[PDB]
Design a protein around this ligand. Sequence first.
Ligand SMILES: NC(=O)c1cnc2[nH]ccc2c1N[C@@H]1[C@@H]2C[C@@H]3C[C@H]1C[C@@](O)(C3)C2
Ligand SMILES: NC(=O)c1cnc2[nH]ccc2c1N[C@@H]1[C@@H]2C[C@@H]3C[C@H]1C[C@@](O)(C3)C2
Lengths: 286, 285
Amino acid sequence: VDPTHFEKRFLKRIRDLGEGHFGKVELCRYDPEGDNTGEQVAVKSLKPNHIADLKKEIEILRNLYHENIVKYKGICTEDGGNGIKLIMEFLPSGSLKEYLPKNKNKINLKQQLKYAVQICKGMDYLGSRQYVHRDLAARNVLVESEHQVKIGDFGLTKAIETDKEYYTVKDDRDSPVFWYAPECLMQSKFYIASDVWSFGVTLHELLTYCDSDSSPMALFLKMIGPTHGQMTVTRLVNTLKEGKRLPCPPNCPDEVYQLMRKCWEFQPSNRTSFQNLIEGFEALLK
Amino acid sequence: VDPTHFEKRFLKRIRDLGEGHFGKVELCRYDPEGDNTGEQVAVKSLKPHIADLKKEIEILRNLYHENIVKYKGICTEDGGNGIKLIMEFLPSGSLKEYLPKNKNKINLKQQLKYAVQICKGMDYLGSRQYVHRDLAARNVLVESEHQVKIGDFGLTKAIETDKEYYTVKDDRDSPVFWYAPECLMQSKFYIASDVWSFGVTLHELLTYCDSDSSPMALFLKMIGPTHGQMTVTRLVNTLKEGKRLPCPPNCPDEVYQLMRKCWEFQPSNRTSFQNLIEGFEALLK
Ligand SMILES: NC(=O)c1cnc2[nH]ccc2c1N[C@@H]1[C@@H]2C[C@@H]3C[C@H]1C[C@@](O)(C3)C2
Ligand SMILES: NC(=O)c1cnc2[nH]ccc2c1N[C@@H]1[C@@H]2C[C@@H]3C[C@H]1C[C@@](O)(C3)C2
């Protein structure tokens, strides 16, 4: 037997954890003895050319090993044919989007900066492996415990070619535009520095406890206008070109906001690094 | 096992340190155990010129001096002409990065000691028949509070024996505000040309690398900020008239007079690195 081989007939759905246009994550119990004693797992599946993407995502995740990256558990391959499901460890506390609004009383600035350092460690590790994540947002950071977070979704993660600085994306319709660097929005180019920009926005969310009224979308739509439709991205690009950025969160020290601003230099080459962010946060935590 | 051969599979990128002249420098950890405990190294490679990089590698490989950044090795491609230069990593960085953060730590005496070290490293290079062509405070690395090292050799060129200079062809990205008149006017680079650049470097060191008082900003105040493609000719003209960068704040006249000797118009009349060393040492007694 293979413990990474999950048979479809024993993989039983409990409830939804979250879903996109073309993908979804469900809580499942893998219960081969059939007495409701099997382990709970998170299962990512496609909604009935994304199979290739999911298989590549699986091969990425399976080979990533870091305490701040969600753990691969296995796959469920379709008896029928081509289809596949990604099986991951289940973290009950959920993403920062779910967790932070509920745990405001026990999560102070110190712990927010420690989560920020953990995200940076996971991202630095990913970068060293020549991956660009392309979807770094609070909603994709899972809470392991009060003291530990994990990057929990790799659906858009792409490999940077050796001796190149960016990946160019063709399929870009389901893009988190309000987390995206100018080069991504303008030219569909994705550097490691593009993930740093995304980290800055993620840091803003963390600092605002993922409050919906203070979310990146809500704040950018307040700047540009909420009912521009298909012109939203171009107006966003224009607002970024002018130099406008998300404002300092309430109760955020200027030192922290300056580190955030260092993620948001218009030019990718002018932005800070994940290691320089860690150093900056660690200085504030000492 | 060759200790100067660095396997690409164990070189992990951390962050970009800087870039110049078709080259890129990155901090990497050489981490064969896969646990982030490996030694940190500075890795120079091209932005996607290999001949220039290979020549730089061979130069640095054969330089051994306490004030010259240490060559560690190379990372080479398999069945390719690709190559990366591996050097020691100095976490404090260049004077440009370090001095503004450490003014309280680094007084005049220490600045002069750094000046001597720079001169020693440059004089060693000169004795090897090389011209540096890019001596600026950004290219001087801080080993510690007590020690600096010249940290990049991207533009370094050999001067032929029985010749006093190297004639430069590729010059579009030259650091004109550090360049002697002969380099600006005739593209001729002497050892004396490096002495000129050292004087400008000293000015930076004495001003703690403040950008508002940088060589570029100061010269632009003299000649004019918006002369565009005519900047170098206006710079040459100003130099011909005898005008120079002013005395730094709190720099005594005797340090400034040593600096002025670096800036004699004719290269054959300038002070030498050994003469500078003696002059600085006299002040340090
Ligand atoms: N409690 C949970 O939600 C949860 C628990 N363990 C998990 N292991 C892998 C994913 C995952 C979870 N959810 C997913 C995660 C967070 C959020 C909602 C789901 C889809 C998303 O893209 C965005 C990634
Ligand atoms: N902390 C550092 O920056 C650093 C540390 N150790 C190093 N060993 C070799 C280069 C180097 C470093 N940086 C480079 C150096 C200084 C500056 C920025 C880089 C490119 C440059 O041309 C200009 C030479």
